[PDB]
């Protein structure tokens, strides 16, 4: 993975040695090239994964998350050009440095071969993430949102470190390939009940799990646009990727330990979807949407069926592009009205015609209109849970109805009705803004033609 | 607040509309149009503020018992099937200032004549501020009615948006 790690490092020298006025031109241009070469990771085999060295490996689960990861950085640079237009040059280059470093740790997290190395990079992402939220945030609550984000993650990660070290002593190695062949059954005992919790509660917090999600509305709302984009697209999926990997060494105890977490997620997505119906803040409505979507991923991973794992993988890719786009859409309005209230500015379709077409496409995917991968990811999960228990179709059905209600309500409030009279600064949509949205929806609608590349290893 | 006379006048208008909906046919409606008027005409002379008002409350309460469940509404009135139909074609005037220079060049006269109003607005704005702050009581206005211009060359205060509202069929 040095063919991708090393170029990601060279972006840091590139930014600092570039001319004063070309930091945005150089960084965006070269990070796009890095993304283009990331398509070479699709050299996948039906029987064996793609193993490069003793440190890194790539398979059908890591690959889609890697291409999503490297694809987001160029978009995050475009989204940040407005609010950093009048920033000190040596601070514009520190902001880009944090974004580059965050990608560096991410590309090594998903390809990590040893779970302890995965843990270190899994934990190293807090540092650049926390700095962005607290340093380049706008509101007074950015200080209190970094604290909530920080100690929620550590509170779960610290027990995880103890569990992983215990496993290596008991088994011998944390190399993922070795575990596949040396996996042993987890007998039901009080000591193994807490080994299961340590291994999982670290990743349940990052999904997040209902009841452990309070850090997300604070973190995703106070963070800048770039922070929200990465937070809601990739960092949420580190919990999903971890659970998909570590559930290998937790059977058969997952059969009964997974009950309290399924109910929290099955019932959690109704409660969190309902909240979206009554949100006074637009950027906060999108934040609560992610919690609802990730409930299906938590439920999908725990039931442990080939269909659910295929559905879970495609849902994380689908949500990453869709959720990031909605944050960008809500941010374009903010850069004009400079207020996150949803009802402040309405009827924006009259003033910004084309920009109200990206909203429609964003909302249609967000409510899983087929044949979008958003629906494919959701559909497979529903099929898997039906076999798990026929009754779950009730909750899946109810959540679908609510999901469309808060999605079209968001569309109708901002894009329809009568334009607010006392607002006279709704300038025409810029090419930077329009091009930003196209780079979300267009690659999303192309994955429907060949969806097999995002269905995970069990495809 | 509404005066007692206005409320009776309002009830007279509402009852005829509901009555018209039931009757449908003009001649049948025309016959009962006078009969209702007769009931209102006779009690015109009642000069007792207590007795007269008591008649109104029964009049209101008889109407609510006999109102049409589906009264006829004019198409563009609130509730009619044209209300706010064309609000989607009404774009505020200030959107023109964002037009590209090559896009303005297609209407040289309209934008040339537009600058006259914008120039007129800026010139008259400060005078409109002075006119209102001298006629305004110490505690501020007590009613929402506004005064007109009281000189030659002056325009009524707060006139721009009343004058420059979008048309009823802008497209």
């Amino acid at each position: 993975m040095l063919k991708y790690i090393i170029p990601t490092i060279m972006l840091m020298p590139l930014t600092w040695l570039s001319k004063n006025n070309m930091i945005w031109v150089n960084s965006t241009a070269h990070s796009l090239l890095i993304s283009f070469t990331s398509l070479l990771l699709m050299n996948q085999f039906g029987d064996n994964s793609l193993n490069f060295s003793l440190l890194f490996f790539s398979d059908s689960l890591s690959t889609p998350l890697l291409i999503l990861t490297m694809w987001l950085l160029p978009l995050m640079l475009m989204a940040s050009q407005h609010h950093l237009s009048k920033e000190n040059l040596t601070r514009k280059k520190l902001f880009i440095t944090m974004l580059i470093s965050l990608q560096l740790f991410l590309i090594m997290t998903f390809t990590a071969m040893e779970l302890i190395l995965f843990y270190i990079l899994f934990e190293a992402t807090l540092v650049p993430t926390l700095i962005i939220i607290t340093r380049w945030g706008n509101q007074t609550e950015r200080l209190n949102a970094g604290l909530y984000f920080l100690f929620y993650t550590l509170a779960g990660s610290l027990p995880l470190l103890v569990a992983l070290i215990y496993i290596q002593n008991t088994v011998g190695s944390l190399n993922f390939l070795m575990l596949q062949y040396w996996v042993q059954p987890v007998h039901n005992s009080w000591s193994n009940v807490f080994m299961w919790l340590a291994c999982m509660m670290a990743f349940m917090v990052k999904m997040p799990l209902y009841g452990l999600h309070l850090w997300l509305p604070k973190a995703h709302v106070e963070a800048p646009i770039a922070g929200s984009m990465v937070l809601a697209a990739v960092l949420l999926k580190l919990g999903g990727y971890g659970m998909l990997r570590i559930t290998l060494i937790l059977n058969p105890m997952t059969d009964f330990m997974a009950y309290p977490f399924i109910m929290l997620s099955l019932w959690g997505m109704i409660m969190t979807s309902s909240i979206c119906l009554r949100q006074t803040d637009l950027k906060s409505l999108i934040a609560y949407s992610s919690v609802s979507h990730m409930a299906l991923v938590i439920v999908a991973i725990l039931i442990q069926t080939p269909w659910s794992y295929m559905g879970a993988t495609a849902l994380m890719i689908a949500h990453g592009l869709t959720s990031s786009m909605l944050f960008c859409l809500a941010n374009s309005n903010y850069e004009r009205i400079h207020s996150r209230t949803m009802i402040l500015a309405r009827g924006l379709q009259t003033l910004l015609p084309l920009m109200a077409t990206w909203w429609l496409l964003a909302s249609l995917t967000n409510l899983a209109l087929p044949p979008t991968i958003n629906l494919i990811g959701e559909l497979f999960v529903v099929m898997s849970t039906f076999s798990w228990s026929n009754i779950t179709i009730i909750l899946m059905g109810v959540n679908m109805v609510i999901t469309a209600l808060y999605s079209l309500y968001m569309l109708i409030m901002t894009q329809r009705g009568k334009y607010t009279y006392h607002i006279n600064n709704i300038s025409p949509s810029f090419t930077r803004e329009n091009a930003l949205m196209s780079l979300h929806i267009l690659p999303l609608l192309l994955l429907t033609l060949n969806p097999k590349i995002i269905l995970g290893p069990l495809y | 607040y509404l005066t007692h006379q206005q409320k009776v006048l309002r009830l007279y208008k509402r009852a005829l509309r509901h009555l018209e909906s039931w009757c449908i046919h003009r001649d049948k409606y025309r016959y009962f149009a006078c009969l209702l008027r007769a009931r209102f005409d006779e009690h015109k002379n009642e000069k007792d503020m207590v007795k007269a008002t008591q008649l109104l409350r029964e009049a209101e309460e008889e109407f609510w018992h006999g109102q049409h469940p589906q009264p006829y509404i004019f198409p563009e009135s609130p509730g009619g099937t044209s209300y706010e139909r064309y609000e989607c074609y009404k774009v505020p005037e200030w959107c023109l200032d964002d037009w590209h220079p090559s896009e303005k060049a297609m209407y040289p006269d309209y934008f040339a004549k537009r600058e006259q109003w914008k120039k007129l607005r800026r010139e008259s704005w400060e005078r409109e501020v002075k006119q209102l702050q001298e006629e305004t009581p110490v505690g501020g206005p007590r009613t929402e009615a506004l005064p007109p211009a009281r000189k030659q060359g002056d325009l009524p205060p707060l006139w721009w948006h009343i004058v420059t509202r979008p048309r009823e069929r802008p497209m």
Partner: peptide, 12 residues
């Protein structure tokens, strides 16, 4: 009779 129709900028 042709009347000017106000619209948002379409150039961009």
């Amino acid at each position: 009779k042709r009347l000017f129709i106000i619209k948002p900028s379409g150039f961009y």
